[PDB]
Amino acid sequence: GHMINMKVAISMDVDKISNSFEDCKYFLIVRIDDNEVKSTKVIFNDESGKKSIVKENVNAIICKNISEENYKKFSKKIEIYHAEGDDVDKNISLFIEGELSKISNP
Numbered sequence: 001g002h003m004i005n006m007k008v009a010i011s012m013d014v015d016k017i018s019n020s021f022e023d024c025k026y027f028l029i030v031r032i033d034d035n036e037v038k039s040t041k042v043i044f045n046d047e048s049g050k051k052s053i054v055k056e057n058v059n060a061i062i063c064k065n066i067s068e069e070n071y072k073k074f075s076k077k078i079e080i081y082h083a084e085g086d087d088v089d090k091n092i093s094l095f096i097e098g099e100l101s102k103i104s105n106p
Contacts, residue, residue: 003032004033006030006060007030008030008062009029018063019064020067022066022067022070027045032096060081061078061080062082062083068106080102082100084100
């Protein structure tokens, strides 16, 4: 029954989900404010990018994969989820409901 004030980082290549967090080209910052996406952002993935994610106060990350080291960094307040597709919009809807599997075995 709805949701308010979500913030995610989705690991993008150029036009869909990147292979892994370590190989994204940018992060799409999704904004959800009543079970629907009311705006978006692009943080390119070159160092200064990842810094901003810390201060964004993200709710969760979505990716197909992560490196072990970066997991151990980010898994200290932000819920890391598995992608279930290449269709970002399917992965957004699944995340809204919490149907995506939380990666606890990278």
